[PDB]
Amino acid sequence: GMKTKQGVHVHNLVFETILGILEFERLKPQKISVDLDLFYTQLPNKAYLDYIKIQELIQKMMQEKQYLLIEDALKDLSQILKTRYKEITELYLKISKLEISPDSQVGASVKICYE
Amino acid sequence: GMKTKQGVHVHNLVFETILGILEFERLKPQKISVDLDLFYTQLPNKAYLDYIKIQELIQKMMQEKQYLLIEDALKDLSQILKTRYKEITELYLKISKLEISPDSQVGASVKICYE
Amino acid sequence: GMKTKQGVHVHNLVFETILGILEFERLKPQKISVDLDLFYTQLPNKAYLDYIKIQELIQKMMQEKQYLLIEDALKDLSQILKTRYKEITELYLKISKLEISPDSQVGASVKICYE
Amino acid sequence: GMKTKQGVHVHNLVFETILGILEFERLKPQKISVDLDLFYTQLPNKAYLDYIKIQELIQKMMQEKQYLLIEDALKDLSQILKTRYKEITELYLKISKLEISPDSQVGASVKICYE
Ligand SMILES: Nc1nc2nccnc2c(=O)[nH]1
Ligand SMILES: Nc1nc2nccnc2c(=O)[nH]1
Ligand SMILES: Nc1nc2nccnc2c(=O)[nH]1
Ligand SMILES: Nc1nc2nccnc2c(=O)[nH]1
Secondary structure (H helix, E strand, C coil): CEEEEEEEEEEEEEEEECCCCCHHHHHCCEEEEEEEEEEECCCCCCCCCCHHHHHHHHHHHHHHHCCCCHHHHHHHHHHHHHHHCCCEEEEEEEEEECCCCCCCEEEEEEEEEEC | CEEEEEEEEEEEEEEEECCCCCHHHHHCCEEEEEEEEEEECCCCCCCCCCHHHHHHHHHHHHHHHCCCCHHHHHHHHHHHHHHHCCCEEEEEEEEEECCCCCCCEEEEEEEEEEC | CEEEEEEEEEEEEEEEECCCCCHHHHHCCEEEEEEEEEEECCCCCCCCCCHHHHHHHHHHHHHHHCCCCHHHHHHHHHHHHHHHCCCEEEEEEEEEECCCCCCCEEEEEEEEEEC | CEEEEEEEEEEEEEEEECCCCCHHHHHCCEEEEEEEEEEECCCCCCCCCCHHHHHHHHHHHHHHHCCCCHHHHHHHHHHHHHHHCCCEEEEEEEEEECCCCCCCEEEEEEEEEEC
């Protein structure tokens, strides 16, 4: 009678990267903000989803791959994260462009439920 | 065993518009803040719900139509957005009046689940 | 194939009131913050849950009744709000004490689903 | 036709404690932020989940036990809180390390649903 959902959270991860499908955006890196939640039900004893690796992988994939659409980044990153942590039962990833519009915050996300 | 929910997000979209059912409010434009989430399961290849158009449409409809109740704006905007993006499975739209009361933030929303 | 949930929202409604079960707290009014969401499926034509009345009623009940526990306020206010707006399908009300502890924000809430 | 979920909330509880599995982190206390939601359906008359005790217990367990992984703290604290308040139907606890990385906020959580 007990359902336990563990999460690891990396929120407001901010760094600069080439990202975008419009030519003007790809001239120089721009500031983005990433939120990631990884959920699971059980790991091995003393095992953990290391937030250090997780943050470094997200930056590594974005900065090197220089994705076009945010949706392209979400597709690749989510598949990479699930392959690396097969135990996860749910993934939520949102990528926001902080400065692309002065009057709003825009972004795209993916929520994946694995059964 | 995999359910994927993609989202496009325009948050804290701030602009001035005529809005309101009380006569005093309609004399001059007032500052509002709009949050929109559009969710879907699949688009065509390299297709995307362009946050640029989405933001411009919301401003265009509010500024030109000069809605009375927030609920009138929500009714019209949601129907417009779904007609324009029939693929969406869920829409969340919230419109807030930033300055109408000095001691709170008031607003109205609509969450629509399409099956 | 369409489920529409309308909401009216009063967030971060801040005012001073007598509130508390500890004697020291009831000597003078203290600063609180109230969040209220009222959800419904349908109203009459051109009818609306007026956020003006809603905000004024919450302040009126808190300031006059000088509740003991936050839970006492939530019990009374929720019953009052549902009786006044029988059409609501869901109510969420959270009351927070802003200054009662310098190192956290504490509060209590009620979520009510009506069927 | 009425389902009522009461909550007690301690949010952004900030204090310093020894916490961490990396040797450098355990040399000195670091700033953390804790969010706790406790939900229930019914208590006795005039009974309440005292946010004062709750906040003090969380600080007491963290500062004295000097947990290794955040997940170790979550495991212990959640079991302690449920044992102390058997009436709870749902617990959400998130612990975040405020300064461990300058470019993000990292943390871990547990959501437990009791039936
Ligand atoms: N959804 C979406 N819309 C966009 N519009 C303009 C530029 N980039 C994008 C993008 O990356 N995603
Ligand atoms: N729900 C709601 N209440 C209101 N009250 C006053 C003014 N406008 C409004 C409005 O636009 N919506
Ligand atoms: N849950 C709860 N706990 C409290 N603890 C101390 C003071 N007041 C309260 C109160 O109003 N509610
Ligand atoms: N999930 C997780 N990852 C970590 N990585 C580094 C250091 N501590 C931790 C920790 O406490 N939890």
